[PDB]
Amino acid sequence: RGLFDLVDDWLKKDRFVFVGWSGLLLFPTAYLAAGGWMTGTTFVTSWYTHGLASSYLEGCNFLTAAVSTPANSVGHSLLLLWGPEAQGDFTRWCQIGGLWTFVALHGAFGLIGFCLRQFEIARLVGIRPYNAIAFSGPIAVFVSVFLLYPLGQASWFFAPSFGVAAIFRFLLFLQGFHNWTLNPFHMMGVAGILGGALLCAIHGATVENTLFEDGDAANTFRAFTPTQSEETYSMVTANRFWSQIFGVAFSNKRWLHFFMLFVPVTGLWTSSIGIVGLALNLRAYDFVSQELRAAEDPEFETFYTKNHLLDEGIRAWMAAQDQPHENFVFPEEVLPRGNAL
Amino acid sequence: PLGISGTFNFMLVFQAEHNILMHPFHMAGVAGVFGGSLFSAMHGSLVTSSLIRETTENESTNYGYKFGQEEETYNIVAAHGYFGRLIFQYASFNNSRALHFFLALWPVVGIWITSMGISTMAFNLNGFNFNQSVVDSQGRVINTWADILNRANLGIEVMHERNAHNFPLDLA
Amino acid sequence: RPFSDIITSVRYWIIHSITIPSLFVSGWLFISTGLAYDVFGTPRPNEYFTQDRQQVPLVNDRFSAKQELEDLTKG
Amino acid sequence: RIPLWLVGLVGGLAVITMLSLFFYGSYSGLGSSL
């Protein structure tokens, strides 16, 4: 009837890719985060920001290419193309590291626009919105690492660059400087990721091994029409199996599939709380009862004090080349070496 | 070491001496458990989304499943039409058997491949090494992200077992 | 129209037998004519270091960062 | 009309000429440490 109704009926039309209202936020912003990454890893260097090479023009393969974080002198500037740093020039915008905030900002509005996509399709199909709530897990890892972690730090420079090996140094930068593995929020996150991979490997292998005979063929994939009301696997058998192997087992398909939602997602929320606590440098660095004892008793050694000496090697050896803006000129005689290494 | 801090003594010393992160079999199992926790929470949401009304709003959602029943407890056509619009139509498994097989394939193949990464790195066939790989025409070494990753490996290598070594190369 | 009925048709491969090589070679000429080094400011292998500047160039200012990169890219 | 397996054959070996070209330039040109 009205003008709003014609636009509402056009976006929600059955077509190849469902656009909806949320596609106006997703499809422009996701196309430019992805294309900003493919351009930045192919053409744009890191020679002026980090003093590296992170492009395909500079000989890096898929692994050692990245869209890199800007300089520490930029601080937390948004680095707009028209801004006071770039001033409209495209070429000087790329050399400062403007594509990285271009990827991260238009990417953050892609994950907004993709989670709104999951509320919109669920309302048209008419189902409960648990996909949009389980996808809030990965939103809490993008925001609290690519956004909330460099905000608490000195600049955008201490953020993960969007490249394969550039994530890998961020894994190593976070052990030596922060002792991230000791943090109980990672420990509750590893329990959800390795726990979530566990549940789909079991529920994959128990459904597929309690199937009913619905055909004479040896292939069991053929014997399932999608609109049938009979269940395709014996729940009573699978309960009787695991009650004797493992001792305790699900007797509820509604509780089972909810539990496959809770376990992976909670590991992304609990691990997201800790990385917000490392923006503020509130790290779980030391057990002081272990540290006061190892200072007074020069014979008491645990595995825990062995990890601190591994972190002095990370804090001293890479920090010269890690942070060229700070100009660490270490002598050879201050770098902690071991015996004969 | 059978412990918790002993595990991270194991992982870091294994990084300096073998470069596991650049090895493509740790790469094929990070994809196994990130993918595994994806398809876990992606399958567990689409079943819980499309549950059929069998309870009231006062009692629990889970009590609409009586144990050992023969009726199907969720509209599988509904969750197929949702994911058939969330990405596109042809990327959706209408077959629930082939769906519940792909949940068992992806992690298990990802951990078979990974556990044969530790095995092939037990015999000192390490991961990739792109240190000093990018040079200018003059021949000076241009750093990459692998050179920054190398300086993190050199810090753990010169500090692990700080008294056990006597000779310049950690052969063990 | 179904997708597999498109790519098996001849009229599809009539059009895209011209457009694909005319677009792949334009991606070749975008590099071999030295154009990509000037749009994105990526250093050529000749020009990581210069005769004067022998160190690693870094930006060291918030607001005159455009002017400082005008310095480090002339020589 | 073209048989579909001919299409996946020609495009499939075209990818191999693209991939093995990329593993070629890991040992030559830039990024080869020569």
């Binding site: 190849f16 294309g35 493919m38 | 025409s137 | - | -």
Partner: peptide, 28 residues
């Protein structure tokens, strides 16, 4: 029409692969 949907993703992809094959033959 869906010619704007695919070719916003495929016309760039062939253009960048025209550049990635050219970078294999560039040396110092």
């Amino acid at each position: 029409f869906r010619w704007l949907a695919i070719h916003g993703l495929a016309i760039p992809t062939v253009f960048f692969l025209g550049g990635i094959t050219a970078m294999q033959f560039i040396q110092r």
